[PDB]
Amino acid sequence: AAKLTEGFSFAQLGELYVSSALQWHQEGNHHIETMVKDMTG
C-alpha cells in the first residue's frame, strides 16, 4: 500500500485509513488496492 500510494498526501493517506477502516469494521474486508485505485480516479 505504501508502494501504490504514489502522489498521496498525508491527508489522503488519512482519508484512506478511515474509509478502509469502516470496510474492515463493516464488511470484515478492507479492499485497499480497490480503494487506492478508486481514490486516485
Binding site: A11, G14, E15, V18
Partner: protein, 61 residues
C-alpha cells in the same frame, strides 16, 4: 466528547469553500436535493391535502 454531527446547507454549492468537503472531519458526504419527479410530486400533493378538494384523477393530472 461526545460527537458533533454537522449539517450544512447551500443553494450555491459553487460558492462553498472546497476545504469543507471530502474530509472525515468537516463534511465527508454531500447530497443533492433536487426537483421532485412526478411520483414524488403526487406523493407531496396527497400528504399536503389536495385530496380534500381534488378527485383521485384530478390529483394524478
Amino acid at each position: 466528547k461526545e460527537g458533533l454531527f454537522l449539517i450544512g446547507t447551500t443553494n450555491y454549492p459553487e460558492e462553498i469553500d472546497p476545504g469543507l468537503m471530502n474530509r472525515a472531519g468537516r463534511f465527508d458526504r454531500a447530497y443533492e436535493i433536487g426537483l421532485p419527479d412526478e411520483e414524488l410530486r403526487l406523493e407531496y400533493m396527497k400528504m399536503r391535502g389536495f385530496g380534500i378538494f381534488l378527485s383521485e384523477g384530478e390529483i394524478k393530472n
